[PDB]
Design a protein around this nucleic acid. Structure first.
Ligand SMILES: [Mg+2]
Ligand SMILES: [Mg+2]
Lengths: 289, 96, 49, 83, 27, 49, 69
RNA sequence: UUAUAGUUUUUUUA
RNA sequence: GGAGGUCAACAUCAAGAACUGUGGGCCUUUGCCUAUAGAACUUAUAACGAACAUGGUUCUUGCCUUUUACCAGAAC
RNA sequence: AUAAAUUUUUAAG
């Protein structure tokens, strides 16, 4: 479907646009896709960007008739240096398959159940292992803990929907009970491919200050979490100004951890000011940094 | 004269026509001291003239050479997207 | 020739492979309906969103 | 090999092969070679899963003639030598 | 040879507008 | 080039100038059953004549 | 101290004033000169203007029967 | 907790 | 009297493919018809500039917290 | 047998 991919490209561009003007600029040169796509660990937002692709464009006129087939691509998003980025839909198995795999997997378990019965034995968990995540109910469930409780749940889907009516916030995954359904996708390989495909950890850090904290050793760094401090600042008595302005810190650690890109001297346009008594030049006013 | 006639003596125009406050500003003295999209636009404008005609000022002293003159004021007219920042006030000029 | 419908979010078309009359391997937007007994692909189903 | 990272067959790699062949034949030869590689030599290194990706995966070049069919014959059925 | 493939323009659709021949599908 | 919303390949691009082309009846005149593709009609035709 | 106005400022209070001399924008001369005129089917159980108003209207009740939904 | 902090809808996981 | 002026003032420069004066006939000054004289400058891939900017209103968009400031098309 | 390429910033609340 053209327009959906179209909406992807738009929307994602619009979000990066948000983070961008979150400081002040749209300039593409400041924001190489490392910035937005490095996993949180390295200090990036880690947003999973499936925009890019290349988007079949052909000659709409007839494509209101024939399905003329792809004659051209329109570059969905861009870069400055390109590389690429792996995009999700490559890491997600399509439905047809998984229903096929499901069908067979549960056939095998039909047999192995018949044996382990007839032999009056109890399961190998190996005989089951290769199939561990295969199957649409996802065999793991059979052996999840609480089963002889959850036998007495029924009709979970509908409830998982009419929650539409019964509560305020979104719950964007209704369509599954991860208890009944197993878990229908895993990713992490994504993280790996975005990490290296950016040019490897050794380049990615060339953007940061990581040669300014004097660590010669990288991987020994866990960061640290400021998340915990959340309860003990206060609970109520912040006036609204202190709730927001006391919410603008966890940005301003990030935009420091990539400083030397965000401030950089191939900037397209800006009027240079050295800071007051320092030796640093800033290109344009960027208030946070 | 315009400035000191608004009763701001704590803004300073240096000879390149930067505007800097020399006394960290009491807030009221900021409000009375915001200046105009004009007067800022025109500050910048003068800055450009003084910049070019500077480079000449040098050359006449004999300090550069007529080739580095030509390159210089070339470089100016191209990199005014740096050397001034007039594009803050009328942004239209970001066609040029 | 076609049959249409839509369910959940999907727009499904169904072509019986009979009346396709010109056949091809297609990318993964094609489910292939398989006769219960004989086991063939007798119709391609297409999706959209 | 990426196809074998992928935990199941996917139509993707089949249409990739095909639209690569029909661009030029040097790719055609390159394939039939690789079929030699994998089947003859390199089967020994694959677990009884990945055959689930392969067997179909050549199934789709061979049904539709991109292989072409008879290049199968190089494959043999013997208790003599078959893995 | 903008033939009717492509966009009216990339102003709102956020791409770069670039459209290239598709090597894949000819036959 | 502009006013018809084309781009000569080496050409300056401009704006639709008559933006909404999307209104259309479903109308048999120019349809496919009735039209024969022999020569493509590149743009530069449309800018030439 | 919010008071509903009861009044408007007489033009006169303005009228006595001396002028300004500021020149605004929209007053720059334009349009500078005028222009003048010269079998089975039986199985199932069943044997065989403009209303001036709003929230009772036909349209509006369609609309709100769509969107607020 | 710091180089602050009224409006800039204040606050959620894979 | 001639040559010039990085001198001034005052006229004129976008239209029936287009200017003006005059003689004669008709209507009743306009206006129509006929005759006659003179027409610098600027116009046909149309124009005073084989150059190239800015502003206002009005709609359509584009960024999208709001306004200046703006994105790119049109009409006036 | 292809030569098709969007952006980019300052002030005020
Ligand atoms: Mg206020
Ligand atoms: Mg307000």
């Amino acid at each position: 479907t053209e327009p959906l991919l179209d909406i992807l490209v738009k929307g994602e561009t619009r979000i990066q646009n948000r983070v961008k003007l979150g400081l002040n600029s749209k300039m593409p040169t400041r924001f190489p896709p490392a910035v937005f796509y490095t996993p949180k660990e390295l200090g990036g937002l880690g947003m999973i960007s499936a925009s890019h692709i290349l988007i079949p464009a052909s000659d709409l006129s007839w494509s209101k008739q024939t399905d003329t087939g792809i004659t051209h691509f329109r570059a969905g998003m861009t870069h400055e240096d390109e590389k690429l980025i792996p995009t999700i839909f490559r890491y997600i198995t399509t439905w047809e398959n998984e229903f096929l795999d499901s069908q067979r997997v549960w056939a095998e378990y039909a047999t192995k159940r018949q044996e382990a019965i007839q032999q009056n034995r109890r399961l190998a968990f190996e005989e089951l292992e290769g199939s561990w995540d295969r199957g649409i109910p996802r065999i793991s469930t059979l052996f999840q803990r609480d089963r002889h409780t959850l036998a007495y749940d029924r009709g979970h889907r509908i409830r998982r929907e009419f929650k539409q009516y019964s509560l305020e916030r979104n719950s964007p995954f209704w369509w599954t009970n991860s208890h009944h359904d197993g878990k229908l996708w895993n990713l992490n390989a994504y993280r790996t491919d975005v990490i290296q495909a950016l040019g490897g950890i050794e380049t990615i850090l060339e953007h940061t200050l990581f040669k300014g904290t004097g660590f010669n050793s990288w991987e020994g760094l866990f960061w640290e979490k400021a998340s915990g401090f959340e309860d003990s600042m206060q609970f109520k008595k912040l006036t609204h100004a202190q709730r927001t302005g006391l919410s603008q810190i966890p940005n301003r650690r990030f935009t420091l951890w990539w400083s030397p890109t965000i401030n950089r001297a191939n900037v397209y346009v800006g009027f240079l000011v050295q800071l007051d008594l320092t030796g640093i030049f800033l290109h344009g006013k960027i208030p946070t940094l | 004269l315009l400035i000191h006639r608004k009763g701001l003596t704590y803004l300073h125009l240096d000879y390149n026509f930067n505007l800097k406050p020399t006394k960290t500003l009491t807030t009221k003295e900021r409000k009375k001291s915001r200046l105009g999209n004009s007067f800022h636009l025109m500050r910048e404008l003068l800055k450009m003239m003084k910049l070019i005609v500077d480079t000449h000022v040098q050359f006449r002293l004999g300090n550069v050479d007529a080739f580095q003159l030509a390159d210089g004021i070339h470089y100016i007219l191209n990199h005014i997207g740096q050397l001034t920042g007039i594009y803050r006030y009328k942004y239209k000029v970001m066609h040029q | 020739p076609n049959l249409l419908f839509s369910m959940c979010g999907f727009e499904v078309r169904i072509l019986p492979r009979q009346r396709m009359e010109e056949v091809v391997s297609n990318d993964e937007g094609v489910w292939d309906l398989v006769d219960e007994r004989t086991k063939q692909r007798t119709a391609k189903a297409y999706l959209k969103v | 090999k990426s196809s074998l990272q992928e935990s199941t067959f996917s139509k993707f790699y089949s249409i990739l092969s095909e639209r690569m062949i029909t661009f030029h034949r040097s790719w055609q030869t390159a394939y039939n070679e690789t079929f030699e590689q994998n089947y003859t030599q390199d089967i020994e290194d694959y677990e009884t899963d990945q055959l689930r990706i392969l067997g179909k995966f050549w199934g789709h070049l061979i049904s539709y003639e991109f292989l072409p069919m008879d290049c199968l014959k190089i494959i043999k059925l013997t208790e003599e030598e078959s893995c | 040879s903008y033939n009717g493939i492509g966009l009216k323009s990339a102003k709102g659709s956020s791409t770069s507008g670039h459209v290239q021949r598709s090597l894949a599908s000819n036959n | 080039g502009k006013a018809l919303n084309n781009a000569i390949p080496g050409g300056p691009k401009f704006e639709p100038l008559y933006p909404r082309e999307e209104e259309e009846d479903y109308n048999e005149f120019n349809s496919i059953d009735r039209v024969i593709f022999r020569v493509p009609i590149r743009s530069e035709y449309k800018v030439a004549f | 101290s919010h008071r509903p106005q009861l009044e408007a400022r007489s033009g006169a209070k303005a009228a006595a004033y001396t002028p300004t001399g500021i020149e605004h924008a929209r007053l720059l001369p334009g349009h500078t000169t005028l222009k003048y005129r010269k079998s089975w089917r039986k199985g199932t159980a069943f044997g065989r203007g403009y209303i001036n108003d709003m929230t009772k209207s036909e349209y509006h009740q369609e609309f709100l029967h769509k969107h607020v939904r």
